[PDB]
């Protein structure tokens, strides 16, 4: 069972094709992250999964149906970016307005205002809300009813650093129930800990898709294997050169080995089976470093030392 089955779509406006041969398959409990920089492929694929647009050269199958059926949208939350609600209305009255449209019960309103932490700011106007306070309200309408698919377009802008960790903690409680969601951020560290598979895409096409273990293995990107607690410091330090690495032989009881990540990390037992590792530390390449590679994989030449 798959929530979203984007099956060979090609979305165009006029003679230009703004989204070319997209082919996705979101699972039943996975957290997918669409990331887009230059083209509107991130933005248009948001509108394709919702009923906002129509596939010009393909089809999408949200929950096994058409994307615009009323049985689909009653079990689909969506939080758009920079939404500013009705400022003369109230916080509780906005959810009570939104619960009537999605057909949810009104007993879920007093829970979800408490569930996002808006109980102290309920029964006040939306114009006297902060930026992060409106994001708590915008998340709370996405959780109305029993949603099966969430589309969080930049969910944690302007939030508290505690509250953004609890928001993803609410997410990881949701996908254990079986609600596969879709994240769309522009801050890439921070969402790499809770994403299940990335969907980094260029201007038109989809560049790469898969989990973070698959993207670091496919895209050859440097890893940093720094390590303390050294056994004997000489023969173990020199033997990385003929293996095919350039290991920086630090003197102060630490060994830096750079690699190519085909000889992956610890490979089988070899980095650890000598008997005395003594508190190694791993600094793997982030989601952000993979994202700059796939921008270089299709056009988009690197800037200078400090430009942008």
């Amino acid at each position: 069972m798959n929530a979203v089955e984007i099956q060979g779509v090609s979305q165009r406006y006029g003679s230009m094709t703004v989204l070319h041969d997209l082919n996705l398959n979101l699972g039943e409990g996975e957290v997918l992250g669409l990331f887009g920089h230059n083209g509107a492929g991130k933005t248009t694929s948001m509108k394709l999964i919702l009923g906002l647009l129509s596939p010009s050269e393909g089809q999408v199958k949200v929950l096994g149906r058409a994307p615009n059926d009323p049985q689909v949208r009653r079990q689909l939350g969506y939080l758009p970016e920079n939404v500013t609600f009705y400022p003369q209305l109230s916080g509780r009255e906005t959810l009570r307005h939104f619960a009537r449209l999605k057909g949810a019960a009104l007993t879920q309103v007093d829970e979800l205002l408490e569930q996002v932490g808006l109980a102290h700011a309920a029964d006040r106007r939306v114009k006297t809300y902060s930026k992060g306070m409106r994001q708590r309200l915008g998340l709370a309408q996405a959780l109305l009813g029993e949603p099966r698919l969430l589309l969080l377009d930049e969910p944690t802008v302007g939030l508290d650093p505690i509250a953004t960790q609890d928001l993803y903690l609410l997410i990881d409680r949701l996908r254990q129930r079986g609600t596969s969601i879709i994240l769309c951020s522009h801050v890439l560290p921070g969402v790499e800990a809770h994403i299940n598979r990335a969907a980094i895409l260029a201007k038109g096409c989809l560049q790469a898709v898969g989990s973070l273990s698959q993207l670091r293995a496919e895209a050859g990107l440097p890893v940093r294997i720094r390590a303390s607690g050294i056994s004997e410091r000489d023969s173990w330090l020199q033997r990385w050169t003929d293996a095919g690495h350039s290991a920086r032989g630090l003197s102060e009881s630490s060994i830096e080995v750079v690699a190519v990540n085909g000889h992956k990390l610890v490979l089988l037992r070899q980095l650890l089976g000598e008997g005395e590792p003594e508190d190694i530390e791993i600094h793997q390449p982030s989601l952000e470093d993979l994202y700059r590679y796939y921008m270089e994989r299709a056009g988009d030449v690197r800037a200078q030392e400090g430009r942008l």
Partner: protein
């Protein structure tokens, strides 16, 4: 029905608009101050009340609904609302019901305090004619307001920014209240045989402010066509607003 669930929002949001409640208070004060100086100083004062409600009921309707579609697009909730189980017709028609009952209440506080200043300051007003001449007045003032409400949905769906929506809603208010009749007057003064005298009553049917006064002055046309021509101004312009809202 979700045309009513989105109508309850626009009642609660429109009645807390501080810009509307200042004008609706000023409409009720000036309806008393005309009725005070129309009694101490009833068809003679219902014509001056018709000129008052031709100023302000287009202004009340355009103050409510100039930011109905494009004000939700700028707020980002319009893209959110289309992902709900809701057609584009039910958003527009539900806003028309919600904004419609606001100025259907603004004439009940407007003329409800004006008819109180007539029934208590004339002493012999013959009130059997009052409840039919004001019943025809409150109904025809809502239908005038519902035209400019439907005019406001046309200009909201066309523009892309909230600042240029008020620049067109002021332009619609200038054109349909006090530029269309000044260019009727202008043709007569410049020349007499350029324009037919008989033709001019028919040309009042192209202006809902002019059709509003003709059903408060009771003429080559009958009365019943003017009611069906004021309702035709609602039904074409709402259908025009629905055709614009389906092309965003």
């Amino acid at each position: 029905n979700q045309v009513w669930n989105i109508a309850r929002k626009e009642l609660s949001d429109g009645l807390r608009n501080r810009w509307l409640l200042a004008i609706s208070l000023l409409f009720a004060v000036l309806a008393v101050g005309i009725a005070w100086l129309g009694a101490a100083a009833i068809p003679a004062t219902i014509a001056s009340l018709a000129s008052l409600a031709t100023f302000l009921m287009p202004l009340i309707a355009l103050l409510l609904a100039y930011d109905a579609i494009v004000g939700e697009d700028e707020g980002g909730t319009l893209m959110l609302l289309l992902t709900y189980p809701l057609g584009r017709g039910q958003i527009l028609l539900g806003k028309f019901v919600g904004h419609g009952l606001i100025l259907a209440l603004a004439v009940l506080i407007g003329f409800g305090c004006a008819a109180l200043a007539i029934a208590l300051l004339v002493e012999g007003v013959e009130l059997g004619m009052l409840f039919w001449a004001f019943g025809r007045f409150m109904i025809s003032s809502t239908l005038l307001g519902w035209v400019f409400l439907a005019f406001a949905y046309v200009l909201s769906g066309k523009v892309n920014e909230k600042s240029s929506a008020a620049g067109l809603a002021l332009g619609v208010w200038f054109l349909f209240v006090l530029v269309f009749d000044l260019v009727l007057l202008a043709l007569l003064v410049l020349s007499e045989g350029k324009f037919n005298p008989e033709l001019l009553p028919w040309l009042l049917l192209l202006n809902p402010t002019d059709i509003y006064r003709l059903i408060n002055l009771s003429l080559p046309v009958p009365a019943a066509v003017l009611w069906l021509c004021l309702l035709a101004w609602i039904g074409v312009s709402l259908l025009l607003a629905y055709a614009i809202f389906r092309r965003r």
